[model samples]
Target: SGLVPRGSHMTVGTLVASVLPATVFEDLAYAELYSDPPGLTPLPEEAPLIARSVAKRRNEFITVRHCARIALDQLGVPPAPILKGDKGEPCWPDGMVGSLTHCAGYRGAVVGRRDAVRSVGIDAEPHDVLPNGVLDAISLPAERADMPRTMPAALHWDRILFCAKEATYKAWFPLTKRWLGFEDAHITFETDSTGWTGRFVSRILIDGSTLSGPPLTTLRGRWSVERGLVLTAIVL
Candidate 1:
């Protein structure tokens, strides 16, 4: 589930390369994208290098649009459309909030309500290997041994730590109009009979024009290990 190679570049679109089991990727809309492969499939009509950015942007737009529809449908809307905020985040209308992230060859998104729920974030990284320091840079001292000893490192201390901050930021930023970094939120997790429970230990509120919205206290998240990737999203 873990053990990715180091210094690799993943073509984010590739994650949508095949069909996922109906159980996990259950939404019909999502399933259709994978099957039909949107005409907007994001390949450059001209030179590959020249159209790379366009391809990437196109992929992000289409896939994210798919994700938003799926999430909205799950929330009971038969058809869904999401708007965009000034900061480029998806503006899910009334009772919705989530985060969307796409890498070179992979794309991911998670969406849900913001009241009973909090915030949500989804991120994907390539299955390549990585250096030890990569993990160290993101985790605290107590987290180092825990990853290799307890888990395969997918939801490892560092990766989860980084992703948790990401998800938390995704959930928090839009509501507060603030931008948070990896260091802004402290994170921790524990696995038990119920499942791995992720927690945001605390947050540092940055005072700036960006902090124009409400304040956030804590965050909760869940993560998955699949296809050599670590996906974490939180509904705050």
Candidate 2:
């Protein structure tokens, strides 16, 4: 099989390339797609549980797992089914930490040695404006006010903020094993000229329960918009 054609690095309605910006996956292995029309690949033999799922669910599940396996393979790891935990997070092979994401026409997975990264989270969303009134429900009042002033006028800062929270939650929950709601973290973004990417800083507003380390007060992550797809990633 030849390499998948690289499309627009990022876009809103269509994806031209499935690649993540190198900065987002430093020291990790990843595989992704901008858009992949549903294909006939059967669920991997180990994924018997989803065999009878609907076509849409099946396609999303299988495709993302397929990406996960490719990432694992890149690290010289043997292939294995990425089962879901009781909480529904993908259970990677021992000694590895990773995350998976699928949007309207995009899918991606990032994996790394646990020694290098304790955990990781990756999310992708369309670059379009968020639905009206939704921002008020998801954002802090101060966050809402600052978006218009801090973010670049060309980007959908609301959705980017939303993704930052999601990526943060994804990384946080694995370590803490707790529910992190939209209000749990306060996020702010900074601009980047290269690759149209940006950085985000977060304050974990909740008390630590299961986390063993000193109370985690702050976390950092990065974001990018390519070919209309907004992406955010975090590692701990």
Candidate 3:
């Protein structure tokens, strides 16, 4: 019996890989709604972190790291366990920069050399309406002011906006090594003619001049909605 643990990595559309550039090595793995691939094992270091979690959480953790390994290999780096940093963020191998994300039935990773690209932040979220009060809790008054202008009702504005900020924070933390709250950055979204795909900007509320890599006063990124998943990426 040939049982390879391939979780549909070759397909790109379902996870919106278009938001990233060609220079980045990326992989998105999605299992069918009914079942996930077997033999998805987490590296030793990662196993302990999620040892106390439920089966669902364990699967998501393993699958996402599986995706990370593929991405790192594509970047021509050896596969190493991706551990958590002191801030509970991804601690990629030395000389590498990347991020990992997972949601129901979806997982992905994108990586680039630190010298080639300063940092990368990638996120995937289910395209569903945000819960009550959750939106306001994560967003600011100024961010909510212009929702009507862009057919906001047609899309899951709250989740997409939330993802954009998640990505910005991912790309932000590695350089700043400081905690970034949802309120610390302001998010704005714009769409293409089709209204399905577009770009966003997350303006750091605080000063960016003190940052180490790049002055990320405003983190620019791309977004796309398709197949019930919303994906966003910010690459420095």
Q: Compared with the true structure, what per-residue lDDT tens digits does model 1 show for residues 45-145?
A: 21232354665565666665665566567767554455566776776767666667665455555555555444555555544444666765655555555
Better of 1 and 2 by TM-score: 2
Worst 10 residues of 3 by lDDT: 26-35
Off by over 4 Å in 2: 1-26, 37-52, 209-212
TM-score of each: 0.60, 0.84, 0.87
Among all windows of 10 consecutive residues in model 2, the one with the lowest summed lDDT is 1-10
Note the Cα lDDT for every prediction shown.
Answer: 0.50, 0.75, 0.75
Most TM-score-accurate candidate: 3
* Candidate 3 RMSD to the correct structure: 6.2
Q: In model 1, where do residues sit more than 4 Å from their true spots?
A: 1-36, 40-52, 76-83, 104-106, 127-157, 192-215
lDDT of 3 by residue, 55-163 (tens): 9988887877787788777666787998888988888888888888888767887777777777778888889988998989888888877655653578998898888
Candidate no. 3 TM-score: 0.87
Candidate 2: tens digits of C-alpha lDDT, residues 1-236: 11122343343333212233444444578778755545636446556868779978878887888889889999999988888887878889989989999988788888989877777888888888889998987899878888777678888888989888888888887778888888888888777654356678888889755455555677777777877788888766
**TM-score-best of 2 and 3:** 3
lDDT of 3: 0.75
Candidate 1 weakest lDDT stretch, 10 residues: 17-26
